[PDB]
Amino acid sequence: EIRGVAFKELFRFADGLDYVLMGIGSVGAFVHGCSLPLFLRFFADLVNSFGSNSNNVEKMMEEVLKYALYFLVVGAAIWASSWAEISCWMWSGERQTTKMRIKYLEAALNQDIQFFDTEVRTSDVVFAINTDAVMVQDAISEKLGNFIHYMATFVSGFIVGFTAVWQLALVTLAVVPLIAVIGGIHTTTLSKLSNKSQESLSQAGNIVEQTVVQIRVVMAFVGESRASQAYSSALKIAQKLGYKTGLAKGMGLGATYFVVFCCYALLLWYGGYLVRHHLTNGGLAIATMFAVMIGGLALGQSAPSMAAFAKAKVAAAKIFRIIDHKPTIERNSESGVELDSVTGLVELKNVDFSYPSRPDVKILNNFCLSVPAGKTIALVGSSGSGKSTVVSLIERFYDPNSGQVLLDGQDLKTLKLRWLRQQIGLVSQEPALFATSIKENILLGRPDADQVEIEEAARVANAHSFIIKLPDGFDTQVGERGLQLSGGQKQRIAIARAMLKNPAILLLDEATSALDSESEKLVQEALDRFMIGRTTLIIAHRLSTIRKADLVAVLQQGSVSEIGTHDELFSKGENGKLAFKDQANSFWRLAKMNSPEWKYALLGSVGSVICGSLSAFFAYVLSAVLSVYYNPDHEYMIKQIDKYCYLLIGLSSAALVFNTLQHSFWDIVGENLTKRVREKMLSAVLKNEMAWFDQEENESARIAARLALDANNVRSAIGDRISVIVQNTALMLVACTAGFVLQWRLALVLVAVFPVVVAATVLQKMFMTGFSGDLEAAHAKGTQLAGEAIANVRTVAAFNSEAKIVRLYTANLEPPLKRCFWKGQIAGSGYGVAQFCLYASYALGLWYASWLVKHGISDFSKTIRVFMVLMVSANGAAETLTLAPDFIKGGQAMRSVFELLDRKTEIEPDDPDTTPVPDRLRGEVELKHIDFSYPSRPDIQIFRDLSLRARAGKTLALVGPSGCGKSSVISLIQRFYEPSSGRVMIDGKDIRKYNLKAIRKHIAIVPQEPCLFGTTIYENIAYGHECATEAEIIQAATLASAHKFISALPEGYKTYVGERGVQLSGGQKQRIAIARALVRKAEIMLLDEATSALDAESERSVQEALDQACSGRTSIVVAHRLSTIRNAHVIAVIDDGKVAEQGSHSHLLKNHPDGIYARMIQLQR
């Protein structure tokens, strides 16, 4: 394991302004931490004066007034200190992390490629530049400030408590570890159970994704019920674990409240004892209690900052490892010859290169090549041969280990590297389009070029096409969408950027076969205008290229068999605001679906009120005890203290029990609602039709994200909302009742100021959490730009565009920096204002209590009880942070779930209408005058008045070009889609009237590219029939001939398959799909081009399956190749979305002889 760097090195990028910001933030954090208990000290002084000076009214008034002014001063100090701390720390962290990322990227680009090969790899580099960067940022921005603040709080609290009453300081210090340990155990248990629940829900989402991706087969069968069962089982596990999480949370809250109650019972009794012996005052006792508790909790809260410190030390050690690494291969040597002879006469001879990762494996064996000037040369590289390797050696990506490698007769390492890479132009198979605009991509090709050069490169170098037809034109961010560009267009953009680097030799790479001819002809015309551009990769396709290049040589085992011009080089491997009333109605709908759990809810509700009451009750007790401390009769003091302590001890157990009950029952109700919603959501999705599935915004991963997110935030927005609204209502109700019946005037004033103090305490809790936004989202654009640059480092080195990439990264990062600065300023100012208002309200209320006492309106006891009870109950109510307030997004997610459930499918998966279902289908599907138009693309309409025939005891074959919708034909066979105007007779009647599920169970199909379902081959094969037993799957395997390699598998039918399982061959998976089709034993066997996407033994297997299919009922088989359609007796025609003839191939030749398919047959020969 690598060793983390020392703490100081974290601040390597800190400049003078950063040091100033860090100092100011440290001072602010220290002042904040010290001010938290200093207020308690001032409160103790005020209370002691206001209680002792009852007889002397005027002195009491002046004392209370001066201490209220002290409260205002403390409020202002907290305002300023919190503002400075938050703003300075956040902005300094951002300012340092930005420079760190810039240096990291700059160091990364100008490294060697073999460095990425041997040492840290590109994926690790990206993972670092995201996670380690954000980790160090959060550690040095907020964690450090919080650590300083909490250490200050701890020290100041200890000092205040001890110097006030060392005795209670010692006792409370003994108390604190209990509460700290309880809180730590609670947090740890919650985190562990949260991780467990997260992984369980991830599993359930995995079932969701695998179902939605594979919806084709799922609807082809009746397996939606199976998917629902699997989802229900996963959700059952998740909900049982969820029950456990709720119980743990309830026990944690109950235990901490129990220990708090007992501990304050003991502390209050001891404080009464101390006051009785004239050791101290009541106010000093209370202040010591609170201050010592605050200090201990502050140390507890400070520890996580140390954890983050260690993690950031490791992360920054990694980052500095990449940063400090020195480029091994010397680059940009000043010995650059700067040859004026751009023509490369001779190069790449006696080349003995070996790949760095495996130096023993010598890829290139004494390679020699000429590449004469004035003429283009092509290379026939084998797949195992290093065509990319020799290209890299040309580009100087790697240095040849020995060998007489040279260029134009003047070597490579002699004449610099930047200039040489400028001389050579490269195109790549994968276009290198970064996040920036396409015009900026052209600039990245050659920054010296102006806009007119870009236009002409879009005019003469390439044709004017969609690359210009973007709505923004050339100023369009290709990275943000990507799907907008086809792939040929971005390839032509790369061609253009290469055209900018016109001079001297220009290497060419291979292009995919599935590429437009326009890009290809642009490539060859670039070749014609660039005779000095050579090394075109034929790859047995686009033979015009090999026509252009006279010198052609093949490459194998790091050597060339022949050297010279064109020859017989073929057959040697050649191949191819929003409304709220609807919110109330939908809330009623949710509650209605939550009806069965009502009992639990009711019980939970009951627990809530009791919990709330006890919280407020607790406050009152403190109040009363404080009021008792300033009483002359010490015996009456003893009686009151004993009564209150006994009552507190008695109610501690009630607090424990009712916290557990409330949380357990509320969380159980939520889990049931969540699972119930999930099931209904999945069922509604499955009832929908694929015309909705293929539509964008219905992708499998996106659907699963919808399912998870909406479910969880709905359960929050119901359960947490009800629990909060009931519990805090009861708490403030009983608190205000006590306050009113004691002194309604002071109670009314404090009720008026109540929302302010509640908001301030909520903000204190949020500050404890941290005000930093979602940094990864803020840096997302620069993040993905840097990731693309790092992954595509070869292309960046090819155009030596590291400086431009760094500049674009800086430009991307700048607006997030400014936004972060302003967000920090706003957050600091708002938090400070809230705290100042809180302390001003404290001062106002307490001074008003003094004023009431002056006029004889009330007494010290009643006023102090009212003030203390209402303020502590306000803190208890602002403890609202315990339950997550996701309601804001909860409403949107809830309208989302209701619109998804309320969405109607036009094709009913099950037809309610009566249908004349036969046991054995008549198997004579009758396509006639079909004019199907694809819904997704109304422009493309495959079918024009198509009429087809079926053969009951026989089979029909179909053949055509890849363009024709044969898979569309089989889709319309099973009512997968809906024809625009065509009509089809499956059973002497419309398919639309007859039940769809009966159609599914009566028709078996194979997909063109079948993929398997689950762990065991047994279940995947048995999927075809609802009762496959064991024998039926036996002959299903044998007739399909899958059984031989199934037995070759370790455990056969139980062998785990999938991404993590034994990944069978395409032929094997297609054959077992055939086996499943046989399992279904259906009337119509739809054997699509899977009968061609296979191998020779699978080809005889398919011929045998055709034998059985013609023997048993009927089949529609499509296969563009020959020798398979000949098996079927009757063969149809599907050319250009039209039928031309139908019958046997002998019949297809007796009338309408030859044909496009016959020409294909001659070709396949």
Ligand SMILES: CC(C)[C@H](C)[C@@H](O)[C@H](O)[C@@H](C)[C@H]1CC[C@H]2[C@@H]3COC(=O)[C@H]4C[C@H](O)[C@H](O)C[C@]4(C)[C@H]3CC[C@]12C
């Ligand atoms: C004198 C008060 C009215 C004062 C003005 C008030 O603002 C002050 O912040 C009060 C409400 C705080 C000061 C110390 C706090 C306590 C800190 O010490 C404790 O024992 C902790 C333990 C545990 O965290 C409890 O959940 C809260 C609990 C029990 C806190 C309850 C609220 C306080 C009692």
Ligand SMILES: Nc1ncnc2c1ncn2[C@@H]1O[C@H](COP(=O)(O)OP(=O)(O)NP(=O)(O)O)[C@@H](O)[C@H]1O
């Ligand atoms: N990242 C790599 N790690 C190890 N060996 C590599 C790497 N890249 C290429 N090679 C080796 O380089 C040789 C040729 O590269 P390879 O990727 O097999 O084919 P290619 O030159 O890209 N041609 P093709 O397969 O038709 O696309 C083989 O010996 C590879 O093992």
Ligand SMILES: Nc1ncnc2c1ncn2[C@@H]1O[C@H](COP(=O)(O)OP(=O)(O)NP(=O)(O)O)[C@@H](O)[C@H]1O
């Ligand atoms: N959702 C869709 N919306 C619009 N057009 C579609 C859709 N799905 C497929 N197509 C069209 O269907 C045609 C493809 O025909 P298809 O029968 O799927 O053969 P293929 O998959 O291209 N070749 P092959 O694998 O040999 O069967 C193209 O015109 C596609 O654009």
Ligand SMILES: [Mg+2]
């Ligand atoms: Mg290659």
Ligand SMILES: [Mg+2]
């Ligand atoms: Mg098709």
